[PDB]
From a paper:
The parallel α-helical barrel proteins required a different design approach, as sequence-to-structure relationships for the g-a-d-e positions were available to seed the designs, but connecting adjacent parallel helices was not straightforward because of the need to span ~40 Å along the structures. We exploited the Cn symmetry of the parallel α-helical barrel peptides to generate helix–turn–helix–turn–helix units, which could be repeated about the Cn axis to close structures with n central helices and n−1 buttressing helices. Encouraged by the successful design of sc-apCC-6 and sc-CC-7, we extended the seeded design approaches to target α-helical barrel proteins with five, six and eight central helices. Together, these additional designs delivered the de novo proteins sc-CC-5, sc-CC-6 and sc-CC-8. For the parallel targets, the experimental structures show minor fraying at the C termini of the inner helices compared with the seeds and models, which appears to improve the packing of the external three-helix bundles. However, the symmetry of the central parallel helices is maintained. The backbone RMSD values for the repeating helix–turn–helix–turn–helix motifs are ≤0.5 Å, which is expected given the low sequence variation in the loops and the hydrophobic cores of these buttressing helices. The parallel designs all showed some similarity with natural and designed helical solenoid proteins. This was anticipated because the helix–turn–helix–turn–helix tertiary fragments used as connectors came from a set of de novo proteins of this type64.
Computational designs are seeded by the sequences and structures of defined de novo oligomeric barrel-forming peptides, and adjacent helices are connected by loop building. For targets with antiparallel helices, short loops are sufficient.
Residue numbers in the entry: -1 to 55, 58 to 225, 228 to 309
The structure:
């Protein structure tokens, strides 16, 4: 309850560091990169702290690890911004450590039958593939991009199958979290297409993002008649807009970049509206998630202007 809210706060903070690290890449602004770097290690330390507390007491532990994975992603971006091979190699170590913690926590969450914690660990696995995809870009590592690609395909196939089993359980939060995982899988694929200069894989990631976008939009109005599953469907839509912008970057397509930017503006409006409503009614976890959705729309806009 309280440990969940601390984790969501940190996840929001890390998303702000990622937005800053992204802008530093666009502008070549190294002061911005050093700044984000200090913020991302502050976040990772606080997140590494909350992960021990929640384990020594499960949903907040996976949320703490998500924050760690998001901090590691900001590290990989800063390494791209500064051209720092040492930092990239540090991000590689940090990401594999996340991948190990998220594979173990995912394994026992399926045995224990904890559907939300499993969906949350599966998300952290997808975050690890994203981080590895960025380390591949920084280092020029083809084999690491292939490792990332194979990771993202496993997440996709398993999130799709576990999503249909959450439809048969009436677990709408897990249904949203598995949609988010498929959206993160599309993000990892567009990054690997960028890293490999691969056009067929970007066309693949594009078909995947459009599938998630259509499904998350439908599930969002269905949930509108939860308030948490509602905000999670919005996050999924924001994450799909991020993948569209990435494919607009990888294919050098401007109509796709305009379409990605227009969806990001649409989600932002809806999230601001919903967050206003959740604030007045005291839906603190929902307000947190709508906050997270605005952050993701901001990241999508950054990429959309880079394209």
């Amino acid at each position: 309850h309280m440990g969940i809210a601390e984790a969501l706060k940190l996840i929001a903070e890390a998303l702000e560091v990622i937005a800053k690290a992204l802008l530093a890449i666009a502008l070549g602004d190294k002061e911005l990169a050093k700044e984000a770097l200090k913020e991302a290690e502050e976040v990772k330390k606080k997140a590494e702290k909350l992960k021990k507390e929640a384990e020594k007491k499960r949903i907040a532990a996976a949320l703490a690890l998500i924050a760690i994975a998001l901090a590691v992603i900001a590290l990989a971006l800063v390494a791209i911004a500064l051209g720092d091979k040492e930092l990239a190699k540090k991000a590689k170590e940090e990401a594999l450590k996340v991948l190990k913690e998220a594979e173990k926590g995912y394994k026992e969450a399926k045995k224990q039958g904890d559907e939300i914690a499993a969906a949350l660990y599966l998300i952290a696995i997808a975050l690890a593939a994203i981080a590895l995809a960025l380390v591949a870009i920084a280092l020029g590592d083809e084999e690491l991009a292939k490792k990332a690609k194979e990771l993202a395909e496993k997440v996709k196939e398993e999130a799709e199958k576990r999503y249909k089993e959450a439809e048969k359980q009436g677990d709408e939060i897990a249904k949203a979290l598995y949609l988010i995982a498929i959206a993160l899988a599309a993000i990892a694929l567009a990054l690997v297409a960028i890293a490999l200069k691969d056009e067929k894989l970007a066309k693949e990631a594009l078909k995947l993002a459009l599938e998630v976008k259509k499904k998350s939009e439908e599930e969002y109005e269905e949930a509108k008649k939860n308030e948490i599953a509602k905000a999670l469907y919005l996050i999924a839509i924001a994450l799909a807009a991020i993948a569209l912008a990435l494919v607009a970057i990888a294919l050098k397509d401007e109509e796709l970049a305009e379409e990605a930017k227009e969806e990001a503006e649409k989600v932002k409006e809806e999230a601001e509206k919903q967050a206003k409503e959740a604030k007045e009614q005291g839906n603190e976890i929902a307000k947190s998630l709508y906050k997270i959705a605005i952050s993701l729309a901001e990241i999508a806009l950054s990429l959309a202007e880079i394209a």
